[PDB]
Amino acid sequence: SVIKPDMKIKLRMEGAVNGHPFAIEGVGLGKPFEGKQSMDLKVKEGGPLPFAYDILTTVFNRVFAKYPENIVDYFKQSFPEGYSWERSMNYEDGGICNATNDITLDGDCYIYEIRFDGVNFPANGPVMQKRTVKWEPSTEKLYVRDGVLKGDVNMALSLEGGGHYRCDFKTTYKAKKVVQLPDYHFVDHHIEIKSHDKDYSNVNLHEHAEAHSELP
């Protein structure tokens, strides 16, 4: 098995928000079978970022999700070849972010090639005004469509001025080789920025994720 209890992460994100380019790189580690990971991110270009860093965090790998034996694990199956994903994040005020991640594996280190592009964020909105606090925990709904895996989730950012800012995620996951497709299921998530410096030039990011096949 290429999936070990402890694995590394290396990534580079190039992107733009409202037409302003930036780039960020990261290094991390996680426990695939425990559905836990953490990483240190460093802004390489476009700093200091003029937008809420939180819109980027869920873009910085479902392989890091605890899948019980009774649920087909589309992600761990995909390796060593790997998989890629595409996603559109539709914020309630019209801001729209498109992102992609092509994930490969070199030894015990997952490598991510990420692209991020957000547009139409209002200048006086919580994103450009940097009023976000964190993403609330969530439950992603995963289902198969036309031979590939889809994942949708209702996300919400708590705001400093109180209340929440909603966004709808629609992700498509594509393995780079034929793998068994899972039945309809869920993945609970909780992403958190544990630390960061003044302008988010440096960010420590963690995520906790577990799948389950029944709710009620």
> Domain locations in the chain?
1-216
Give the Cβ contact number of residue 134 at 10 Å.
Answer: 14
**Determination approach:** X-ray
- This structure's resolution (Å) is 1.8
Q: Which residues lie below 8 Å from residue 180, measured CB to CB, with a gap of 6+? A: 72, 74, 77
* Interstrand relation of 148-159 and 138-145 (parallel, antiparallel or unpaired): antiparallel
* Cα 214 to Cα 141, 183, 195, 197, 211, distances in angstroms: 11, 11, 34, 40, 9
Angle at 152 between CA 108 and CA 67, to 5 degrees: 40
Q: Quick one: CATH architecture of 1-216?
A: Beta Barrel (2.40)
Q: Which of 193, 149, 145 is nearest to 175 (CA)?
A: 149
Which residue type does 117 have?
A: D
Indicate the annotated binding residues. 196, 206, 208
CA distance 15 to 97: 10
Residue with token string 């998989």: 83
What residues form the annotated binding site for Cu(2+)?
196, 206, 208
Could you give the CA distance from residue 97 to residue 117 in angstroms, rounded to a whole number?
A: 5
State how beta strands 36-45 and 202-212 pair.
antiparallel
- By 3-state DSSP, what share of the chain in percent is helix, strand and coil, each rounded to 5? 5, 55, 35
Per the CB < 8 A criterion, the answer to whether 76 and 3 are in contact is yes
109: nearest Cα among 26, 28, 203: 28
Which among 81, 97, 114 is positioned nearest to 11, based on CA atoms? 114
